[PDB]
Amino acid sequence: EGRTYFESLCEEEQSLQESQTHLLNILDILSVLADPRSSDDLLTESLKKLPDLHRELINSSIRLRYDKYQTREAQLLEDTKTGRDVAAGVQNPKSISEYYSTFEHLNRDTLRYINLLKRLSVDLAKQVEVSDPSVTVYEMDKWVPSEKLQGILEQYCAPDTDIRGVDAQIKNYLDQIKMA
């Protein structure tokens, strides 16, 4: 019958304790054979117990090896089951197939945000403005525009502001130069 790895491993420790008791019962008999002040009767009595324990130790060290093999075949049987067989138990597919789809739509538009800050990045037409004749040189990297043009462009990216109302505010600034 089909056993699990956990049950076959705990059964190994049960057969391990039976092998320990016969091992300790033999080892003290060899000790009383090696006493220096040993008595004549104990060396005759202890040897009669010896062959009954010897063939009992072999029958316990054989079942220990046999349960080391049965746990090894149960260990490998549970590793082939891992993977997509454990997750074939859920009964909510529509909740996960929209959760992964709303995450795969999130990172697709995070890249589109980064691709609109440095790589497309439309700028103004830098028209030079010169007032002081004491500088005699100009660099086109620190040209800051007018404050009436900046504050309109500052509040446009700012929130809670319509798309069609400030288009007239652009046309307010655009036709103001066209009169002058």
Binding site: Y5, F6, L9, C10, E12, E13, L16, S19, Q20, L23, L24, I26, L27, D28, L30, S31, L33, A34, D35, P36, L50, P51, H54, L57, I58, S61, L64, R65, K68, R72, L76, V86, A87, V90, N92, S95, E98, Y99, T102, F103, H105, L106, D109, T110, R112, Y113, L116, L120, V122, L124, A125, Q127, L153, Y156, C157, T161, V166, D167, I170, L174
Partner: protein
């Protein structure tokens, strides 16, 4: 010097079932050392030869008694270590399957950001159509 189809899948199996296990193989050295020792005392051979473990000592036979008790605790603790390591992997496999099960209260948190991040593209693509029309005239 060719091979066969049977001869390849007989070495494809010996590799797949090969284990090295230092606490277990050291315990069976003690079980083996006593069965060959109590085998000879039944027959009658006991001499001053170094082919076996030892002949007769008080200290060194009890040193084998200490070795029989030390490697037993090393093997007993290692089976307990494999027991708890298997129990923990089954728990995290179940609580991940529990976190995958519901997935309903965490869905409204994503759709807030994705409706906020789709709002922020609406301003910049309108800002880059506002600055693009003032430059086209002049």
């Amino acid at each position: 010097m060719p091979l066969s189809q049977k001869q390849i899948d007989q070495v494809r199996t010996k590799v797949h079932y090969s284990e090295v296990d230092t606490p277990f193989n050291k315990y069976l050295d003690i079980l083996g050392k006593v069965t060959k020792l109590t085998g000879s005392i039944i027959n009658g051979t006991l001499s001053n030869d170094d082919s076996k473990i030892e002949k007769l000592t008080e200290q060194n036979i009890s040193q084998l008694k200490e070795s029989a008790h030390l490697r037993f605790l090393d093997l007993q603790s290692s089976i307990d270590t494999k027991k708890v390591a298997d129990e923990n992997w089954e728990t995290c496999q179940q609580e991940t399957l529990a976190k995958l099960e519901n997935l309903k209260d965490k869905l409204p948190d994503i759709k807030s950001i994705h409706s906020k991040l789709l709002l922020r593209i609406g301003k910049l693509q309108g800002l880059y159509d506002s600055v693009q029309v003032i430059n086209r005239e002049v």
